[PDB]
Design a protein around this ligand. Structure first.
Ligand SMILES: C[Se@@+](CC[C@H](N)C(=O)O)C[C@H]1O[C@@H](n2cnc3c(N)ncnc32)[C@H](O)[C@@H]1O
Length: 184
């Protein structure tokens, strides 16, 4: 049974190409009208923090829910750093490769729907993750190209990250991947 997913969306991009709108349209998640309306004590996905999501976070997702902010990647750092404090259990995703047509093959920077599916998979909701990904023709391939990493991540093993990113200093590497989008 899929955990309850809640999304606050910054209405910036055109919604016909936004993956969060599609999640909501099919009932995998529900939109809320503000960040304050997101459930307190829930897991919130947050690419700006250094603490990776682990399988044991499942217990929180089941009981409080899973929250996300949908915005442009150009605004993502500013939004997450300035508007969510204390209210949530903030977790980045472990390092994964994007499968969407825009950023295919590139690390860490995922679409909202890929992030939701990754979170679900890691927390043991593999069937739900696939149901979500099947909303796009390229969706299931996200698990395929990340299969070896996801298997370790779902088993609580984060050792793939340094080899995949190719740096010991993962923190700096992640900060730079996002800096590229912030400044471009
Ligand atoms: C900035 Se949003 C851009 C949406 C895109 N135009 C689309 O239509 O799907 C992607 C959101 O997905 C989650 N997310 C993505 N990657 C990660 C990550 N690596 N760690 C943690 N969370 C991640 C964050 O909630 C993001 O805010």
């Amino acid at each position: 049974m899929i955990p309850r997913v809640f999304i606050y969306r910054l209405p910036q991009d055109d919604p016909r190409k936004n993956t969060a709108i599609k999640l909501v349209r099919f009932g995998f998640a529900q939109l809320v009208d503000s960040i304050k309306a997101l459930p307190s004590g829930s897991i919130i996905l947050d690419p700006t923090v250094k603490t990776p999501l682990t399988p044991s976070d499942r217990v929180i997702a089941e009981s409080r829910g899973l929250s996300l902010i949908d915005c442009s990647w150009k605004r993502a750092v500013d939004v997450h750093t300035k508007f969510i404090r204390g209210k949530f259990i903030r977790r980045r995703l472990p390092l994964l490769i994007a499968a969407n047509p825009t950023h295919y093959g590139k690390p860490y920077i995922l679409s909202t729907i890929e992030a939701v599916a990754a979170a679900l998979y890691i927390m043991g909701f593999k069937d739900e993750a696939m149901e979500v990904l099947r909303l796009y023709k390229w969706g299931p391939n996200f698990i395929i190209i990340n299969q070896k990493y996801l298997e370790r991540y779902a088993a609580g093993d984060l050792s793939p990250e340094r080899e995949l990113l190719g740096v010991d200093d993962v923190d700096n590497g992640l900060e730079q991947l996002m800096r590229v989008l912030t400044n471009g």
